[PDB]
């Protein structure tokens, strides 16, 4: 599979100027979506923050006194309506929701138990949520007039950090792939060929179209299908809108309110 270099070629988006640098990157991001099926940006300094977060997650996975499995999803307070945050034992991973970061109460306990990882995760979540909301604005701008705003939900969005890891797409609105520890993540282009983005040890983030956005754009934007082919740690933000909100679609240029919710879409 051919390597796809992105350092130096993708638009540069600086941590202390996210909103403005994304505006300037709009045209380039649009052409990525049209020409590749996924989007990319270089965020100087993101790589060291993500690597520190991932390395500390890896240490937490082996910690025993207070284990990470003390915060398995089935023993963590969950929202009445919503997804499932907490730890997922074994290939083993955690979902850090925006609700969890705000302790919505006891749900934040995994972060108080491992505050070094948890501080980094909250930091990366906030950067990633700002970035992915602006990627969402770019995609919206490519859609017909009258397209509602994506309205990504802070509390429902979650950051997944994976330890120890087939063709798949993501179910949510948008995914933000953060620089993984190792090469291996691959994407299919519009022509059906596979490329392997160079993102390990880099400041490059990838933005995925998820199946919810495919649905809301009635097919205009295909899901960013990808796979992982190893020879290890990775993290990605999954952004969804409010679970209880009604679905919508832009069919042939007209806004189209459905009776099912975004939470129904997942199930
Ligand atoms: Fe994925």
C-alpha 168 – ligand 1 centre gap (Å): 6
Tell the residue number behind the tokens 């649905």, with chain if given.
215
Q: What are phi and psi of 138, to 5 degrees?
A: -60, -50
C-alpha 115 – ligand 1 centre gap (Å): 26
C-alpha 145 – ligand 1 centre gap (Å): 30
CA atoms within 13 A on the CB side of 193: 9
C-alpha 164 – ligand 1 centre gap (Å): 14
**Residue 31 has which token pair?**
């052409």
C-alpha 103 – ligand 1 centre gap (Å): 26
Cα Rg, the chain, nearest whole Å: 18
C-alpha 146 – ligand 1 centre gap (Å): 30
Cβ-contact 110, 94 below 8 angstroms: yes
Residue list for the binding site for 2-oxoglutarate: 160, 164, 232, 234
C-alpha 75 – ligand 1 centre gap (Å): 25
Q: How far is CA 175 from CA 109, 111, 195, 258, in A?
A: 25, 22, 18, 23
- 133 contacts: CB under 8 Å, gap ≥ 6: 150, 152, 239
Residue list for the binding site for Fe(3+): 168, 226
Report d(CA 192, CA 169) in Å as an integer: 14
Cβ-contact 51, 169 below 8 angstroms: no
Tell me the pairing of strands 3-4 and 194-197. Answer: parallel
**Residue 192 has which token pair?**
């059906």
Please list, residue by residue across 34-71, b when 16 or more beta carbons sit within 10 angstroms of its beta carbon and e when fewer do. eebbbbbbbbeebbebbbbbbebbbebbeeeeeebeeb
Cβ-contact 169, 224 below 8 angstroms: yes
C-alpha 31 – ligand 1 centre gap (Å): 22
C-alpha 19 – ligand 1 centre gap (Å): 26
C-alpha 194 – ligand 1 centre gap (Å): 15
Q: How far is CA 191 from CA 37, 185, 231, in A?
A: 10, 18, 25
Domains of the chain, first to last: 3-266 (2.60.120.330)
DSSP the chain: --EE--TTTSPB--GGGHHHHHHHHHHHHHHHHHHHSSEEEE-TTHHHHHHHHHHHHHHHHH--SS-GGGGBGGGS---SSS---EEE---EEEEEEHHHHTT---TTHHHHHSHHHHHHHHHHHHHHHHHHHHHHHHHHHTSPTTPPP--B-TTT-EEEEEE----B--SSSEEEEEPPSSS-EEEE-TTS-EEEE--TTSSEEEEEEPHHHHHHTTTSS----EEE----EEEEEEE-B-TTSEEEEEETTEEEEEEEEHHHHH-
The structure was resolved to a resolution in Å of: 2.4
Cβ-contact 137, 122 below 8 angstroms: no
């Amino acid at each position: 599979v051919p390597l796809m270099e992105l350092s130096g070629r993708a638009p540069v988006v600086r941590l202390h100027d996210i909103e403005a640098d994304m505006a300037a990157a709009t045209d380039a991001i649009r052409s990525q979506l049209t020409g590749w099926g996924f989007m990319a940006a270089e965020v100087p300094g993101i790589g060291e923050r993500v690597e520190a977060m991932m390395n500390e997650f890896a240490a937490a996975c082996r910690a025993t006194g207070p284990s990470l499995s003390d915060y398995a999803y089935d023993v963590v307070p969950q929202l009445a309506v919503g997804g499932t945050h907490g730890f997922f034992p074994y290939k083993e991973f955690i979902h850090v929701s925006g609700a969890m970061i705000g302790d919505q109460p006891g749900a934040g306990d995994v972060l108080r138990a491992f505050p070094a990882f948890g501080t980094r995760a909250a930091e990366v979540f906030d950067i990633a949520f700002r970035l992915i909301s602006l990627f969402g604005e770019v995609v919206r701008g490519m859609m017909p007039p009258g397209t509602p705003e994506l309205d990504l939900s802070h509390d429902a969005t979650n950051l997944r950090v994976i330890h120890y890891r087939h063709e798949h797409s993501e179910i949510q609105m948008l995914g933000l792939q953060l620089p993984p520890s190792d090469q291996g993540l691959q994407y299919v282009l519009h022509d059906g060929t596979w490329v392997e983005p160079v993102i390990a040890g880099t400041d490059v983030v990838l933005c995925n179209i998820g199946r919810m956005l495919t649905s809301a754009s009635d097919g205009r934007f295909r899901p960013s299908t990808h796979r992982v082919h190893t020879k290890r740690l990775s993290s990605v933000l999954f952004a969804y809108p409010q679970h209880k909100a009604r679905q919508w679609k832009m069919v042939d240029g007209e806004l189209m309110s459905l009776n099912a919710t975004w939470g129904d879409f997942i199930d």
